[PDB]
RNA sequence: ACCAAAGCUAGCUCAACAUACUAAACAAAUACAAAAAUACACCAAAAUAAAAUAAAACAUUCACCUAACAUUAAAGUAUAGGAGAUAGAAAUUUUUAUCCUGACGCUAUAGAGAUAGUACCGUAAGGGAAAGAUGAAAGAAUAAAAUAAAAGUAAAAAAAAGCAAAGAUUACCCCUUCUACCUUUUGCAUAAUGGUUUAACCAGAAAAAAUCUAACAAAGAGAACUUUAGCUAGAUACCCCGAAACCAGACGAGCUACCCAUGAGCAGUUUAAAAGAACCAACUCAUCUAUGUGGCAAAAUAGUGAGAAGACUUGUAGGUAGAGGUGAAAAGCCUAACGAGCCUGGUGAUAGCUGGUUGUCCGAGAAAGAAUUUUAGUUCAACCUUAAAAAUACCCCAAAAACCCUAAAUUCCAAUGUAUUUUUAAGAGAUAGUCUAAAAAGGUACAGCUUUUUAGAAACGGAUACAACCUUGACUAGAGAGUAAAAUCUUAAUACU
RNA sequence: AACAAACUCCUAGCCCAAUACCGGACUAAUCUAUUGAAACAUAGAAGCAAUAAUGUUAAUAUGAGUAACAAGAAGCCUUUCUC
RNA sequence: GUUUACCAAAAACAUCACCUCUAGCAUUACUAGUAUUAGAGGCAAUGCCUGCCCAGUGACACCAGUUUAACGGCCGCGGUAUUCUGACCGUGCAAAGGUAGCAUAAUCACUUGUUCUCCAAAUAAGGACUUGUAUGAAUGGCCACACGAGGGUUUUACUGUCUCUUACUUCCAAUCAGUGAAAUUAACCUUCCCGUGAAGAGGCGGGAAUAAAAAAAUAAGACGAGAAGACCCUAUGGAGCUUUAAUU
RNA sequence: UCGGAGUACAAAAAACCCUCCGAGUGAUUUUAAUCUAGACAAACCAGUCAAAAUAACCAUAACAUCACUUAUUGAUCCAAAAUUUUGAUCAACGGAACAAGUUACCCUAGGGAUAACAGCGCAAUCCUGUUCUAGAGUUCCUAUCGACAAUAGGGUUUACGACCUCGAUGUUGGAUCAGGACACCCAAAUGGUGCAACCGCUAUUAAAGGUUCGUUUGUUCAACGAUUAAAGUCCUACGUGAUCUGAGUUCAGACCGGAGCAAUCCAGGUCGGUUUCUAUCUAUUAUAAAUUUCUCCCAGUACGAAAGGACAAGAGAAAUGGGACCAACCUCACAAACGCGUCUCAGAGAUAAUUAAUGAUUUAAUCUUAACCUAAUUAACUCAUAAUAAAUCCAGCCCUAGAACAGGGCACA
């Protein structure tokens, strides 16, 4: 016969994890890019409009399992929390960046 | 060579052709980076570090006034009139260690370069040279062998009139009455005492200048230099004298 | 090449045949 | 080309020829070649087949 | 021992100088059908060159390509271009005379085509060769000297068995071991391509950026330019043969198509008939079959056939010429090939396509990701080669990477084992893949089938033969030794009174 | 057990395969600059090397002494016969 | 009568006849002519005929319009007389809806349509039946005399065509004497079988056979010799022809 | 061309004329600024995020939202608008500024990288045998058959793949000559039967020989007439064109129907249409020792209610095939050749399926991959037997011997 399926060809977007645990990253480096929320951002990690995670401070990347407390203004998420039984808590994965360099140091500039 | 194709038969396409695909040099929008580059003026930079270096080694001497011709004979700078070079600009790279006292004439100067020279008690003046005149000025001996009268130096174009008319740039066409007040402003700005140049024994040499219609020192338009006989020819007709002096 | 599952008792690689012959069952005597 | 390849085979062919002579001379005494060689090495007698 | 071999002149090439440039011969005859002494004439002419090609197609465009007055620079600059390919000035500058001219040019398949535009092939324009060797004397031919060396033959036919040889051997064979050589391919002893053999001849060429060596150095260069260690000079580089075609100008209607002139043929027989009537010769066509197929013949011979007073055959001579002529249209014929002649010039047309590519040895050594009138090709990335700089590369434990269920396992990383990797500067090839094991898909849970991902291989040993399976770190010599993969696989069965 | 490799030992070394592309060291034969003087050395230059293009020219073979070609007879020699 | 000189001589072209079209006229064609003339074409004597259609295109008029012997075209669906058939009727679209004739034809397929005659036996041939849903009227329909190196069938007569080959002559042929060519050729010391293999082996593997040469024969193989496959595809390779391709 | 899910199971990437969904934009207002660290992605061109800083406004205010939110899009040049800005089903979507058909009149360069013919691979299709019994067979599974299903093998058909050949592997049917297989049509032997006999159906064993002549079609095939013991199936480059044929396919001419405005096209028909080769090598160029049918007879017997009607055994005559020969007839103008004419044609061993005797494992029985002995029994095949036979005159002539070379005669002829 004849082919009915069309348009199935599309290259991958290379969605995945870029920096593993222990990698030393600087400010602005994209930790990971994703389609859906696979890894939630953590401490010192921003979140772009396309759900990509980028480090805000220079340091060591760490991955952690933590609890999930949704924003009350998010109607869909708060409804899911409402229907949970009393003994359960949501758990999600997070990406952290523990800072390495200190904020600054005091130096002698002038001795009057 | 290879095995078959356009490699072994030597008929591969031109340079920059990517096989039907639009080439890299044809998919970039046109913008003016070299628009009118053949008409932009160029100035060879001269640093005060090199100017001090020439004087210490005897390449040039401050006793005699220094202009573009003396720099070329000293192998300090090379000027190519063909490549739209309009002279030498003074830069301030070595202003801190400049201890010479000269009467230098250039085609462009900076605020710090002028201040550095005036600190020691020198004179800086900027003059414009047409490419027809600049070729003669940089290579005087070849010109004198062409058997032609010395022509008048042309005026700067409308674009370069303000630069050589203001007293801030020490323009050759500037009003001399505004030089002393402009000189003192630089002395006040950089905090150096302005020397009284009129009390130095070289005041006659330091005050030497050129007429705007004059090319060389002491020579006049219309003169023919017969180098073989070591004699200078001068015109006599009223029209010839008027044309070469107007 | 044939599929992993066929209808004709797929012939093993010769190295695998030796493995199937050295790992036989010998009843106690 | 045949000269070099045969030169490699020259050593093999002569070694094969020696074994046939050793086997022929060993069978004459009623002892096979495999029994004549291993039971001679066990006596620490290191004689090559040549 | 024949056939053969050897020789060094003939002359030529590229310049320079240079008179200033259709030679030599012209007694007679030469543009009547040239070389024929002699009668009322006509005579003469111009209209931009086009295209093959490049732009990977092709329409605007495409250097030189008829007419420039040169050289050093301005400059491959200003400008002109489906603004693509490529095309490209000027203003302004530089240049001292005569002699010193000859040859790191050839030596009879070279150099001009040349002993010669002659033989010879073409109606014509046109194409166009091979060919010489003794010595001081051949007025020294019972004459003399020289290599006796190419393929091919003779002296001298052959004796089982094999890519014609090697290992050898007292011995030519007999024995043992080896699937011609290049090209082209995933893979060729292949029954895929080319070559009978010999001699002669025949195919890599350019200096912008770069690397190596040297001069001088913040300056270099014997002007004109380049310069934040650069500038000047040297050395290191990129083939040959071949289309069908396209354009312009010549020469061809003595064959053939048609026509205009001028001539010449048709006997007998049958009919009031010279009626595109009838029988049958000369004569003209060529239906059918058989010989012939490098033939007698680049279209014929033998037999047999159709017309044979007409729209008929035929001689001489003239006319129409290729964007055309001519045609009772067969897309026929126009000098033995006409879907549009031949010759020369443009022309060394251009081919991603086929074939060819000439001494020895040594080092390292690649199977395909992305665009593309693109998949028969190119240009990038990866990989790799040469040189250089630098510090980290592989293996890599614990920790770590998603939400309903989910295998083999990947990513990332210290130690450790080991020397690799990155960067900079120059680069080409390749981009047409075959099988085995594993995870899948299409198919017939078919293919030596097809599309992807991971891994392997392309022995001179083993599976008798064998590209892909197994053993194997590919040097040379030895008549030494130890080993690896591996050589014949199992059963072949049932009395129940 | 044995027999069995480009593997690995043993004795000497010049001390490890290859297609496209790339790198290197040498070198046959010519001419020229200086040497050399029974045929060479160090250099500078190129028409610088042919077992392969249904390659060009010339000469040789094989096919093969094979395919195929021709003169009517006798005599007294040029005259009679047969077509 | 004519044509593809050199594979087609025919059913193709021409042709008398009929018809359409364009032109009122002078010094080189047509023509030393003047519409009963001369060109540009179609179709093919004769005989009986040549039906309907200017919507489209083209031409003329160059405006309405006029022209098909100009290019071309010349219909569905549903119901209806016991059954069958469908005179008729409903409804729709068109410029008109294939009229006369002939017909399983040289006429898509169905197809060896069905039937009769011919033969012992008929995918042949002739005569009928006939929607041929793709026949058809000067791109001509239909009928006939004469004619045909066209194509098909039947009877009669003859015969080596054949059942079934044979005898005898000449040119070839084979021996002797003379002259003496061509395609071809990697090297050959050039076997058979089974198996293997770039998938059909004189050459590999496992076995068999095996003194060496000459002459005369038959053509199974050497993927025999000959022509760089005419078929097929590819090439940003050509050319001829046509037009509603692009540019002009 | 662009996006999502599976193939691609756990970092990334990953294909098919693979399996399924979509996009070539709408709705709304929160109308979404300037400038810059660092990164993801990637051949390139493109695509994405983004802290700090500045301005905007709660006076220390930057993610436009929703529809699977992911895709909702286009490079230069060029053109138009104010200079801010815009412009393509350029969808062939990395895009030539603007270009269709046909070629069987075809040409050139190449490809077995790629088709038709042939081989090969494979077995969907096809063919052959077995396993399983529901049932058909009046009762009765398997005398003859056997649905739904199981399993093994053959390589004939149409396909599938595109692996060897396109610097050529010549292509249907006949003519000639046939080589081979057995899954046998006839001939021979035998088991079973819903086998009385006759005529049949079915199964086992055997391949030495044989398998007709005609009308139509180019035909293989098929139909029909006559006959035979029977008119087998298939392989062999669907054998065989360097042996022949060219009717058909399969060039150039020409009509008819149809498609196209045309050129031209049609596995639609019709008429016509060049079939080349001198044999180099391999291979090859005569032994025999028959086969079938019909008649008569047995016999109108056996067998059967009758109707019908045998086998074996005996005798004879023909046909084909093998090998020979002219007294006659016939071809016959040589003294020969020739057919249409004449002549001749064979014994023993040995077997397959099957049938029977004796007899043990199993003191019965039982033909025995139990022993000994023995019996009935297909065709091949083997052999008896027959043919061949003398080593060494050979110039010449003759010959029923012969291409040459050889061979037989030449004393009385
Ligand atoms: C099929 O017809 C083809 C020829 C085409 S040209 C007559 N066969 C080729 O072998
Ligand atoms: K071939
Ligand atoms: K080839
Ligand atoms: K070749
Ligand atoms: K003429
Ligand atoms: K002739
Ligand atoms: K290509
Ligand atoms: K005729
Ligand atoms: K009309
Ligand atoms: K009829
Ligand atoms: K005729
Ligand atoms: K043969
Ligand atoms: K495209
Ligand atoms: K198949
Ligand atoms: K072929
Ligand atoms: K048979
Ligand atoms: K042979
Ligand atoms: K006869
Ligand atoms: K028993
Ligand atoms: Mg993809
Ligand atoms: Mg996808
Ligand atoms: Mg090549
Ligand atoms: Mg290639
Ligand atoms: Mg394109
Ligand atoms: Mg400069
Ligand atoms: Mg596989
Ligand atoms: Mg072009
Ligand atoms: Mg090209
Ligand atoms: Mg031009
Ligand atoms: Mg313009
Ligand atoms: Mg010469
Ligand atoms: Mg020579
Ligand atoms: Mg010789
Ligand atoms: Mg041998
Ligand atoms: Mg091989
Ligand atoms: Mg191939
Ligand atoms: Mg290759
Ligand atoms: Mg070959
Ligand atoms: Mg080839
Ligand atoms: Mg050849
Ligand atoms: Mg350079
Ligand atoms: Mg052109
Ligand atoms: Mg022309
Ligand atoms: Mg004539
Ligand atoms: Mg007459
Ligand atoms: Mg007549
Ligand atoms: Mg004749
Ligand atoms: Mg004849
Ligand atoms: Mg005759
Ligand atoms: Mg006649
Ligand atoms: Mg007649
Ligand atoms: Mg002429
Ligand atoms: Mg014409
Ligand atoms: Mg004619
Ligand atoms: Mg025609
Ligand atoms: Mg035609
Ligand atoms: Mg010609
Ligand atoms: Mg070329
Ligand atoms: Mg590829
Ligand atoms: Mg690269
Ligand atoms: Mg770990
Ligand atoms: Mg590490
Ligand atoms: Mg490729
Ligand atoms: Mg593959
Ligand atoms: Mg495969
Ligand atoms: Mg791989
Ligand atoms: Mg081996
Ligand atoms: Mg080793
Ligand atoms: Mg060993
Ligand atoms: Mg190596
Ligand atoms: Mg390769
Ligand atoms: Mg040298
Ligand atoms: Mg050379
Ligand atoms: Mg040579
Ligand atoms: Mg040839
Ligand atoms: Mg050659
Ligand atoms: Mg010669
Ligand atoms: Mg000869
Ligand atoms: Mg011969
Ligand atoms: Mg002869
Ligand atoms: Mg006629
Ligand atoms: Mg003809
Ligand atoms: Mg004729
Ligand atoms: Mg003819
Ligand atoms: Mg009429
Ligand atoms: Mg008529
Ligand atoms: Mg006609
Ligand atoms: Mg007609
Ligand atoms: Mg009509
Ligand atoms: Mg009208
Ligand atoms: Mg009728
Ligand atoms: Mg009719
Ligand atoms: Mg029909
Ligand atoms: Mg017929
Ligand atoms: Mg007939
Ligand atoms: Mg009829
Ligand atoms: Mg019709
Ligand atoms: Mg009409
Ligand atoms: Mg018609
Ligand atoms: Mg008549
Ligand atoms: Mg007739
Ligand atoms: Mg008759
Ligand atoms: Mg002879
Ligand atoms: Mg032999
Ligand atoms: Mg074989
Ligand atoms: Mg062998
Ligand atoms: Mg063999
Ligand atoms: Mg002969
Ligand atoms: Mg012969
Ligand atoms: Mg061969
Ligand atoms: Mg053949
Ligand atoms: Mg051949
Ligand atoms: Mg070809
Ligand atoms: Mg074709
Ligand atoms: Mg293409
Ligand atoms: Mg083209
Ligand atoms: Mg062209
Ligand atoms: Mg043309
Ligand atoms: Mg148009
Ligand atoms: Mg990256
Ligand atoms: Mg901010
Ligand atoms: Mg462009
Ligand atoms: Mg594209
Ligand atoms: Mg893309
Ligand atoms: Mg372009
Ligand atoms: Mg035709
Ligand atoms: Mg061709
Ligand atoms: Mg391929
Ligand atoms: Mg064939
Ligand atoms: Mg096939
Ligand atoms: Mg084949
Ligand atoms: Mg099978
Ligand atoms: Mg029942
Ligand atoms: Mg099966
Ligand atoms: Mg293939
Ligand atoms: Mg394939
Ligand atoms: Mg060949
Ligand atoms: Mg036959
Ligand atoms: Mg047979
Ligand atoms: Mg049987
Ligand atoms: Mg029977
Ligand atoms: Mg055949
Ligand atoms: Mg045939
Ligand atoms: Mg023939
Ligand atoms: Mg043949
Ligand atoms: Mg025919
Ligand atoms: Mg027609
Ligand atoms: Mg005929
Ligand atoms: Mg025909
Ligand atoms: Mg022979
Ligand atoms: Mg023959
Ligand atoms: Mg009887
Ligand atoms: Mg007989
Ligand atoms: Mg008993
Ligand atoms: Mg015997
Ligand atoms: Mg005798």
**What is the rounded CA–CA span in Å between residue B217 and residue B157?**
24
Is B190 exposed, middle or buried, given 0-12, 13-18 or 19+ CB atoms closer than 10 A? middle
Nearest to B88 by CA among B98, B78, B97: B78
CA of B5 to the centre of ligand 56 (A): 41
**What is the rounded CA–CA span in Å between residue B22 and residue B27?**
7
Nearest nucleotide, CA A15 to C1': H12
CA of C27 to the centre of ligand 32 (A): 93
Secondary structure of chain A as H, E, C letters: CCCCCCCCCCCCCCCEECCCCCCEECCCCEEEECCCCCCEECCCECCCCCCCEEECCCEEEEEEEEECCCCCCCHHHHHHHHCCCCCCCCEEEEEEEEECCCCCCCCCCCCC
Residue partners of A83: CB distance under 8 A and separation at least 6:
none
Residue B215 is encoded by which pair of tokens? 């090319």
Nearest nucleotide, CA D11 to C1': E479
Q: How far is CA A106 from the centre of its chain?
A: 33
Task: Show the CA angle centred on residue B173, arms to residues B169 and B179, nearest 5°.
Answer: 50
Contact B86, B40 (CB under 8 A): no
State the resolution, in angstroms. 3.5
How was this one solved? Answer: cryo-EM
Is B187 exposed, middle or buried, given 0-12, 13-18 or 19+ CB atoms closer than 10 A? middle
Query: Which residue range is the domain that position A30 belongs to?
Result: 1-112
**What is the rounded CA–CA span in Å between residue A27 and residue A18?**
15
Contact B20, B13 (CB under 8 A): no
Q: How many domains does chain A have?
A: 1
Contact B214, B153 (CB under 8 A): yes
Q: Straight-line distance from CA A9 to C1' H25, in Å?
A: 22
Residue partners of D15: CB distance under 8 A and separation at least 6:
D49
Kindly list the domain boundaries of chain B, sorted by start residue.
39-246
DSSP class of C13: P
Contact B14, B39 (CB under 8 A): no
Q: Where residue A94 sits, what CATH number does that domain have?
A: 2.40.50.100
């Amino acid at each position: 016969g004849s082919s009915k399926n069309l348009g199935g060809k599309s290259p991958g977007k290379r969605f995945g994890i870029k920096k593993m645990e222990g990698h030393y990253v600087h400010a602005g480096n994209i930790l990971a890019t994703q389609r859906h929320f696979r890894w939630h951002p953590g401490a010192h990690v921003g979140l772009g409009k396309n759900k990509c995670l980028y480090a805000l401070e220079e340091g060591v990347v760490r991955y952690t399992k933590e609890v999930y407390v949704p924003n009350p203004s998010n109607s869909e998420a708060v409804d899911l929390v409402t229907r949970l039984p009393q003994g359960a808590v949501l758990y999600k994965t997070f990406v952290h960046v523990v800072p390495a360099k200190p904020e600054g140091t005091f130096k002698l500039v002038a001795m009057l | 060579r290879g095995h078959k194709g356009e490699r072994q038969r030597g008929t591969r396409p031109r340079l920059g052709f990517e096989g039907g695909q639009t080439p890299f040099y044809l998919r970039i929008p046109k913008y003016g980076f070299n628009e009118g580059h053949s008409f932009r003026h160029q100035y060879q930079p001269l640093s005060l570090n090199r100017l001090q270096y020439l004087i210490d080694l005897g390449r040039v001497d401050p006793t005699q006034p220094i202009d573009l011709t003396q720099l070329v004979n000293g192998r300090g700078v090379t000027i190519q009139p063909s490549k739209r070079d309009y002279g030498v600009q003074l830069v301030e790279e070595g202003a801190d260690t400049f201890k010479a006292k000269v009467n230098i004439e250039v085609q462009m100067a900076s605020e710090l370069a002028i201040a550095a020279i005036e600190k020691n008690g020198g004179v800086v003046t900027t003059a414009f040279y047409d490419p027809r005149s600049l070729e003669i000025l940089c290579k005087p001996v070849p010109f004198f062998l062409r058997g032609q009268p010395i022509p008048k130096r042309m005026l700067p174009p409308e674009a370069l009139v303000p630069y050589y008319t203001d007293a801030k740039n020490r323009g050759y066409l500037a009003d001399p009455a505004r030089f002393p007040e402009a000189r003192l402003e630089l002395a006040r700005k950089y905090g150096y005492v302005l020397p009284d140049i009129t009390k130095d024994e070289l005041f006659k040499m330091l005050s030497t200048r050129k007429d705007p219609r004059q090319i060389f020192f002491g020579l006049a338009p219309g003169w023919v230099v017969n180098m073989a006989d070591k004699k200078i020819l001068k015109p006599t007709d009223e029209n010839l004298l008027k044309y070469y002096s107007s | 090449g044939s599929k992993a599952v066929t209808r004709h008792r797929r012939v093993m690689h010769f190295e695998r045949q030796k493995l199937m012959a050295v790992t036989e069952y010998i009843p106690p005597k | 080309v045949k000269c070099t390849r045969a030169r490699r085979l020259k050593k093999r062919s002569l070694r094969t020829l020696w074994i046939n002579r050793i086997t022929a001379a060993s069978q004459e005494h009623g002892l096979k070649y495999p029994a004549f060689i291993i039971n001679l090495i066990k006596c620490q007698v290191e004689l090559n087949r040549k």
